[PDB]
Symmetry: D2
Subunit: 172 residues, 4 copies
Amino acid sequence: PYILVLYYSRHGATAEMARQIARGVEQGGFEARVRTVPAVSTGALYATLEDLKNCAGLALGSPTRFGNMASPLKYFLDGTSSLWLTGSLVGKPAAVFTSTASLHGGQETTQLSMLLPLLHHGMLVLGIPYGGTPYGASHFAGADGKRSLDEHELTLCRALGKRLAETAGKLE
Amino acid sequence: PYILVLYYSRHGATAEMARQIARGVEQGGFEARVRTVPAVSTGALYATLEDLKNCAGLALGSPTRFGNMASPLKYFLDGTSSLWLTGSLVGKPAAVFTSTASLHGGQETTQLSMLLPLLHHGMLVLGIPYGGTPYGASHFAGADGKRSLDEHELTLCRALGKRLAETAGKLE
Amino acid sequence: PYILVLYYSRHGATAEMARQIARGVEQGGFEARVRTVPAVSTGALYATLEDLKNCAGLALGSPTRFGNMASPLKYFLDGTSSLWLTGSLVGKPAAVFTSTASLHGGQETTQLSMLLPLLHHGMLVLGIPYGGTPYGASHFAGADGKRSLDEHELTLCRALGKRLAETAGKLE
Amino acid sequence: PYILVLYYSRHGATAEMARQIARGVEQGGFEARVRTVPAVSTGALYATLEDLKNCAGLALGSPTRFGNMASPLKYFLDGTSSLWLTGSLVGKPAAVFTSTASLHGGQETTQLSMLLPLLHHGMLVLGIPYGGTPYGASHFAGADGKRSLDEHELTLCRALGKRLAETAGKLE
Ligand SMILES: Cc1cc2nc3c(=O)[nH]c(=O)nc-3n(C[C@H](O)[C@H](O)[C@H](O)COP(=O)(O)O)c2cc1C
Ligand SMILES: Cc1cc2nc3c(=O)[nH]c(=O)nc-3n(C[C@H](O)[C@H](O)[C@H](O)COP(=O)(O)O)c2cc1C
Ligand SMILES: Cc1cc2nc3c(=O)[nH]c(=O)nc-3n(C[C@H](O)[C@H](O)[C@H](O)COP(=O)(O)O)c2cc1C
Ligand SMILES: Cc1cc2nc3c(=O)[nH]c(=O)nc-3n(C[C@H](O)[C@H](O)[C@H](O)COP(=O)(O)O)c2cc1C
């Protein structure tokens, strides 16, 4: 009965997108469990392996950091061999979303790169039909970082959340 | 009641994979409509826009040519604005497959690059869970080109065909 | 003494970018040979294999068609086995550029996908440092298609042309 | 006078590749500074920002973890805004390398995904001309993990190291 909305956020932009996507999910006929991951070294409650194992589907979100997802997120996925092994996530639908400092700061490629692990877990990936890209939702935040979630972005975040939920519905 | 198995093949390697994938589809509870595309300039029956519009799901296959799909295939997709526009393929599951001259001649990247258009058409993409990659089926054919479809490759082609069909089944 | 500026264009948007990139090249200390490819089925002079073989470096441009380059371009590259074989382009610098109907219509991914063949030919690829992306130049043309080349886009086209030329200069 | 050979390794496979690449570099007319990164949570000396700032070129290596680089590596790159900002690495050549548990466990895509940050730093990327792929060196280590670096893999690691060094030489 839930879609996991899993994300990392440093200055709140991705956190905001997560919340909007969650709402999409709810109007897709599903409950949204929004969870984040702890910072690493040498907004929301923390995710555990259970949240992943028992989700019906998943939205994965990160700020774009040099064309890839953020390392606290990567670190969380890095701990999922067990799920890989017994093969959960297999068959469950998934979508990604990202926040960016420039208009063309490589969201598409960050979204691309984030679809990869989900394909390793054998999930079913989907984007947005016909920020915001065909691969998932993106938000543009400016060098400033303060630019708030605009009209179409917020709308697209919800569309994705919804589509994800309905897909999880269809698959039963 | 059909999955479209759409491919281009020049010396038969991809044609063979198409046939094996078709069989997977049949054992997934669906009929396989195998279709190819005509060579361009300046194995199977030709595909038409109808085959695409009315499929329940789709397998797309091409030999890897410099990291991308073959241009006769690309040319066929290039003619699908109309479907894009009214938004068919939207919601329907899809998977890719490729044939290669070397072990690591970039199948993954060709498969990647082929998933892109399907995401532009708003399809749901899936690979192989836990040649053959997590992104779709690949066959290794050698510089020679004669190396035939091996045991695990043939098995993986069928798995994909099947998974595709069952997914299309689940989505109803 | 020349950089090949090789592109396909259907309604002139990419043709325009090619010209702007050519100018960048000239101010990089090199002559720009701008060439296109003939349409296929079943702006500039046509490119031949000689243009490729004897260039010092290369800019490759196409409209984004479903996340990939256009099939007339692909068809031209499809005819370069011979060069692949004897290994020209090996060592020579390359960059890409693309034109798009939407803001986030997948330029990055089209640019990505276009870098792939150049890597198969063993070229050295470069983007834009610190439309327009880090992977190459993009132009946004609108659903309309009439939106002309804007200030920063035109500037970025030239930067790339220049950087390409200077790199080819450095490599000697 | 040095190429930075920067990598993360957990069970030594990537560490081995780093060493072989280093040797390639030396025979390319350059000194190889091999450096790793510390594990994160919530083989070689550690890299510092200085190693990056003052390298003439760079090889980046990681085990493939779900289609992406390892999070300790990502975390190190995650700390390079400053270099991004003042624009070092800009103009310097770069190549990647990866180690994998399966034959087609997505090295190409991991290599791809690793080229992305280097393009954000405005480096010049190169692969292998005409494991081992056109995008960089890969090693196959088996589910076991014990499979040692084979003949052609070891040879390809050196080729890349060498090509990288010579390129850095040419650029001066
Ligand atoms: C080290 C790091 C790398 C970044 N790399 C990029 C990038 O390559 N392209 C871009 O547009 N923005 C980049 N940014 C900006 C972030 O994407 C931006 O801060 C993000 O929208 C904030 O997300 P958050 O508020 O959820 O933490 C980077 C930021 C950091 C801290
Ligand atoms: C122009 C062209 C480009 C090719 N590029 C690659 C490549 O980059 N990597 C590779 O491993 N094989 C490459 N090949 C080999 C084909 O992938 C191989 O012939 C394929 O398996 C045959 O597929 P088919 O029999 O269905 O036509 C290329 C072949 C042609 C004709
Ligand atoms: C069949 C085809 C596919 C296209 N696919 C996309 C696409 O996926 N994303 C996008 O933004 N625009 C897409 N477009 C719009 C083109 O990218 C746009 O027309 C381009 O800027 C024109 O380039 P040209 O004038 O050089 O021919 C497509 C156009 C055609 C004809
Ligand atoms: C969590 C994690 C994720 C992994 N993901 C993949 C993968 O998707 N594909 C693959 O072939 N191997 C995968 N592996 C295997 C590693 O790539 C393999 O252990 C690597 O060759 C070891 O590198 P190292 O000895 O330098 O640490 C993964 C291993 C770990 C620990």
